[PDB]
Design a protein around this ligand. Structure first.
Ligand SMILES: [K+]
Ligand SMILES: [Mg+2]
Ligand SMILES: [Mg+2]
Ligand SMILES: [Mg+2]
Ligand SMILES: [Mg+2]
Ligand SMILES: [Mg+2]
Ligand SMILES: [Mg+2]
Ligand SMILES: [Mg+2]
Ligand SMILES: [Mg+2]
Ligand SMILES: [Mg+2]
Ligand SMILES: [Mg+2]
Ligand SMILES: [Mg+2]
Lengths: 404, 282, 82, 49, 136, 99, 49, 112
């Protein structure tokens, strides 16, 4: 074969890359995503829920053969897992922030930062709406252009692709290195939702409440002028009227009513929410709506399987890029360990039932090592290797030992 | 059943200037190429006499790239109701119109400012004309490596028995494959052929263009039908504000249901050494 | 600048194809002024459509007022010898 | 008008100079190959025939 | 045309407002702010005096044969006047690269209206409202 | 679609002018070509060779000849270019000249 | 150059073989609707004697 | 194989996705500079179409892609790309079917 790609990569139509489609964002498009996020309401809460499902349950670092890595770091012994857990103390927050940004925006992006001594401080995220990548004819990022508000002006600069890092969940293709904003991708559905909310709110004011209509004068009789109606308005004034006010009139005064004209705004809200949730790939229940015949049995099993599958795909996509673009470079550049090691970052399942896991362990624990049980049950493994590697429970080995 | 989802193409002109010239991707819309003076001869002198100066003098060829543009505007009612993607079609047309633009700028410079001419006066218009035109350039101490050719000239050349007979060409490729024959790009010491279209040269009949000095063609007394030249001594200078090359932008109107596509490029074309080039005349 | 009604644009419009086809299927003759609106004749350029009644299925389908044999609805261009 | 190149061509930037200088006309050189070359010991001399 | 700040001279921006910017070939060398007219197919040249010759004002300096941007009808511009002008004066090409008033010229109709007055040999602000061609 | 055109030289800041793609059409009107034949049952039976296959082949060949006539008649009548050989150089040179 | 073929049913030549039971005859018939049109007549040249 | 294809779970989802949407998933083998295997690299399926012989087997791949001012085009031999087809007209079909184009009427009806 060949040491370089020989298919082309459909990117640079001659603009920033090409201007017709979601591959090109100005700083204005980026600030539109920011405006959708910061403007609150149901849209912002739903995309914040999407981040919480994908990344909110926290994470765990694994290295295959971690014990074999045992090394004196600074007189103190560590494994690579122990070094990484110390290098990234608050990784749960970082994963949730980056993973959130990588759902909203086309990419999460950030720097590596150092202690004055040259020791690793942190992977420092940057505000993604402030930054756009510049990429080559084969779609790889070569530089980053940044625009930022200062004193009402816009301090602006360009940075190399070498010392930033970036992560893309929403790839347009396996070759895409720039990604898609789901907010821009579904912009029409967002605007439809907001416009129907505004339409309902205005319609409730006009039509949700009955309104009093006093008609004055006999039909085909003497006309009544505005200065005449002013005196009638003084009598039936809703400002000074009370709940149990009574009226006495001649035959030529009629207190008509504009009734509240019924419309099913509940059904309109449900339909809007059904569109928006599905467009964002959330389950309908996240919108406080729900549906008939769908709350139980195999229909429920399916929608929850689809949701967990979507979460797994995003989690793996994030995991691999964070290891390859952040962790391995940090190990290589600031750690005494081998950066080519089999590091995995895994993110927890948000919708796992511990009671289902407990049932499984009761049913088939006799085929699982104590280590595998500790893994499934989300516990530290036993301190003694045979106790971890064995299949009969550690409490059974203790009572068997007490039998000597 | 559904109607035919198709459009039949119009005439497409031949685009060669990027290959057939030295291309400069300029950093500025205006600029200069520096040129050294010709070689001279060291002068005779007596013993003990002062050596007189005759140092290298310099000048420049200025480039002054002109924004070629092409644009289109269509209503969204039309765009939505179209048989095919109207925006893809207008993109392809806009891109083609700018490549044609480059080729017009290139060919008009190439034909007008070539400093040598071989007048065939009818007669031996085939290989002998190419060899004679190489002779005209060689007589100014440059060596050409490329030729640019009109459709009429091509037709004459491929009727020449020296190319059309396998005995005389040493291969039957010209008889079989005409213009695509490898000998056609490897003749009289020229290692490239650049087949032009007839409409390419600037007659001044096209809107917004004011014509060149010559007639491009090879079918009447005095037409220039080919140019034999050094490819490294004719420059096509391309400038773009937002990249290396032609930029297409998608306009959408702030108020109306209107969308459009607009292309631009800045191009100039200039000889470094116009003596390195000869036209062939009917 | 091109609107959908503009003359150079008409062949791009799906509706210009659809309504010309539909006009050919509705006509009984080339006499456009009799059969169509002045608007349709202009908007769909019906002078340029080969309208003559030959593409109308009712030209060929039998529809006799008294039918004792179930002959009505037979289309002559669907027989053995057509 | 609005800010534009021909207003500021020598104020906000400098025009490009191409860094490669183009050559003038070069003559063909062959005498050293095309003839016998004698490195003479004296400016004036004779060869016998 | 120029403005002074301390020791410095700055070029004036010929355009104040408007979108009616259009492209032509220059039939001769032209200077920013000169009135120009059609002299060949999409080709513009400096306007002579007394009317029948105005398409717009040249927006930046050009050599002959270069493409020129030009401001026309609906544009609001900074232009040098040949004589004193006041608000509401109609002005037209002077034949000298400047404008002058209709009142001073042999013509009876202008091409721009003075919005801000100026002395001779300095910039007024004016709105371009008409073009003049060959009527015979 | 209309032919490729040329872009135009434009001053910087000037409006880019419209010269968008413009369309025309070529109409078609498919004419019915027909062929037929008849064979009696007694003839179908007694013939030493399959007359219905022979007649299917004839009808097919006759329709193909019809298609092929319509094609050639369009091709020859509605070519916009022409090389007039004037009774001379009628082999390769005429063919090259028509190209 | 486009050979336009049309068939009201199916896609190509209709060939019908049928027998008339009243006359003891097999008929073999066939039809196609055809037109031919250039999209660009400039893309061809006749050679003329 | 598990070391040759470390992230096969992602690759399978990408190619399996593409081969449901488009008629085929398609891509390259890639090497390191040293000539050791680097990866199987997918290619953008909307940019590529197969050219097939008289018995329906793919001989070459024809690509066009967006470029400065339009489209850029090339041909590649079938001998050094690879491709995968989920939906087929027949077991003989090497080119396959897009379920999007197959059901385009239902998609249009839904959107309308
Ligand atoms: K005067
Ligand atoms: Mg009364
Ligand atoms: Mg200079
Ligand atoms: Mg001296
Ligand atoms: Mg000298
Ligand atoms: Mg000479
Ligand atoms: Mg061949
Ligand atoms: Mg002597
Ligand atoms: Mg205005
Ligand atoms: Mg106006
Ligand atoms: Mg043009
Ligand atoms: Mg045009």
């Amino acid at each position: 074969a060949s040491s370089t790609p020989q298919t082309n990569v459909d990117s640079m139509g001659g603009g920033h890359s090409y201007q017709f489609n979601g591959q090109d964002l100005t700083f204005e498009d980026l600030r539109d995503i920011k405006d959708v996020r910061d403007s609150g309401g149901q849209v912002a809460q739903l995309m914040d829920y999407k981040a919480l499902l994908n990344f909110g349950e926290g994470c765990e670092i694994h290295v295959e053969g971690d014990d074999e890595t045992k090394q004196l770091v600074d007189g103190e012994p560590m494994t690579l897992s122990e070094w990484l857990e110390d290098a990234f103390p608050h990784l749960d927050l970082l994963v949730l922030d980056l993973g959130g940004d990588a759902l909203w925006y086309p990419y999460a992006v950030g720097e590596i930062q150092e202690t004055i001594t040259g020791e690793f401080k942190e992977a420092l995220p940057a505000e993604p709406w402030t930054l756009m990548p510049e990429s080559d004819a084969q779609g790889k990022v070569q530089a980053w252009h940044q625009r930022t508000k200062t004193h009402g002006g816009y301090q602006t600069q360009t940075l190399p692709a070498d010392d930033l890092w970036h992560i893309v969940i929403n790839k347009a293709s396996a070759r895409d290195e720039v990604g898609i904003s789901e907010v821009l991708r579904n912009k029409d559905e967002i605007q439809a939702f907001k416009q129907n909310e505004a339409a309902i709110n205005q319609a409730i004011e006009l039509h949700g409440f009955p309104q009093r209509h006093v008609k004055v004068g006999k039909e085909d009789g003497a006309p009544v002028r505005d200065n005449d109606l002013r005196r009638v308005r003084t009598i039936f004034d809703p400002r000074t009227t009370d709940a149990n006010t009574a009226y006495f009139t001649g035959q030529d005064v009629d207190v008509e009513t504009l009734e509240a004209h019924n419309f099913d705004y509940s059904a309109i809200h449900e339909m809007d929410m059904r569109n928006l949730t599905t467009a964002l790939g959330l389950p309908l229940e996240a919108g406080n709506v729900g549906a008939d015949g769908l709350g139980s049995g195999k229909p429920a099993e399916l929608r929850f399987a689809l949701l967990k599958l979507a979460i797994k795909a995003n989690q793996r996509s994030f995991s691999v890029q964070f290891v390859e673009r952040v962790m391995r470079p940090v190990v290589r550049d600031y750690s005494p360990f081998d950066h080519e090691a089999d590091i995995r970052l895994e993110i927890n399942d948000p919708l796992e039932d511990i009671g289902e896991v407990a049932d499984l362990i009761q049913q088939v624990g006799d085929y699982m090592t104590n280590e595998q049980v500790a893994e499934k049950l989300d516990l530290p493994a036993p301190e003694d290797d045979e106790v971890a590697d064995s299949y009969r429970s550690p409490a059974d080995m203790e009572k068997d030992e007490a039998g000597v | 059943e559904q109607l035919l989802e198709v459009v039949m193409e119009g005439r497409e002109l031949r685009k060669v200037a990027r290959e057939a010239s030295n291309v400069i991707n300029a950093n500025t819309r205006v600029g200069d190429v520096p040129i050294a003076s010709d070689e001279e001869f060291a002068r005779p002198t007596g013993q003990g006499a002062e050596i007189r100066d005759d140092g290298e003098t310099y000048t420049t060829v200025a480039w002054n790239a002109t924004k070629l543009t092409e644009g289109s505007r269509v209503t969204d009612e039309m765009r939505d109701q179209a048989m095919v993607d109207l925006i893809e079609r207008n993109i392809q047309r806009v891109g083609a119109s700018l490549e044609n633009g480059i080729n017009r700028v290139f060919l008009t410079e190439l034909v007008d400012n070539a400093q040598n001419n071989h007048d065939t006066a009818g007669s031996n218009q085939g290989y002998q004309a190419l060899n004679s035109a190489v002779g005209e350039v060689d007589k100014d101490d440059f060596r050409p490596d490329t030729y640019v050719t009109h459709p009429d000239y091509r037709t004459q050349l491929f009727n020449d028995t020296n190319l059309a007979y396998a005995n005389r060409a040493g291969t039957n490729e010209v008889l079989r494959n005409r213009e695509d024959a490898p000998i056609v790009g490897d003749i009289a010491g020229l290692d490239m052929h650049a087949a032009m279209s007839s409409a390419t040269y600037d007659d001044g009949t096209d809107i917004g263009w004011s014509g060149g000095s010559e007639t491009w063609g090879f079918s009447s007394d005095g037409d220039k039908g080919a140019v034999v030249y050094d490819r490294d001594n004719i420059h096509t200078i391309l400038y773009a504000p937002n990249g290396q090359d032609v930029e297409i932008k998608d306009y959408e109107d702030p108020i109306r249901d209107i969308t459009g596509v607009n292309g631009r490029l800045h191009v100039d074309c200039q000889y470094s050494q116009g003596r390195s080039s000869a036209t062939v005349q009917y | 600048m091109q609107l959908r009604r503009s003359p150079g644009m008409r062949p791009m419009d799906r509706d210009w194809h659809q309504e010309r086809a539909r006009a050919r299927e509705q006509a009984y003759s080339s006499d456009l002024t009799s059969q169509f609106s002045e608007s349709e004749i202009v908007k769909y350029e019906l002078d340029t459509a080969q309208i003559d009644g030959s593409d109308n299925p009712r030209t060929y389908i039998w529809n006799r007022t008294i039918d004792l044999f179930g002959m009505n609805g037979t289309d002559v261009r669907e027989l053995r010898n057509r | 008008f609005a800010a534009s190149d021909p207003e500021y061509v020598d104020t906000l930037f400098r025009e490009q100079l191409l860094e490669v200088v183009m050559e003038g006309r070069e003559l063909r050189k062959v005498a050293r190959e095309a003839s016998n070359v004698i490195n003479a010991n004296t400016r004036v001399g004779d060869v016998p025939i | 045309a120029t403005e002074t700040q301390g020791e410095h001279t700055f070029p004036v921006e010929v355009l104040i407002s408007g979108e009616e910017l259009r492209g032509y070939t220059a039939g001769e060398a032209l200077s920013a702010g000169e009135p120009v007219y059609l002299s060949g197919d999409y080709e513009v040249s400096a306007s002579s005096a007394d009317g029948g010759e105005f398409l717009g004002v040249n927006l930046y300096d050009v050599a002959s044969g270069e493409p020129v941007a030009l401001a026309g009808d609906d544009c609001e511009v900074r232009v040098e006047v040949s004589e004193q002008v006041t608000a509401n004066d109609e002005i037209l090409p002077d034949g000298l690269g400047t404008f002058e008033t209709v009142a001073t010229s042999a013509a009876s109709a202008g091409v721009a209206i003075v919005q801000e007055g100026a002395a001779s040999g300095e910039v007024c602000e004016a709105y371009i409202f008409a073009v003049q061609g060959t009527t015979a």
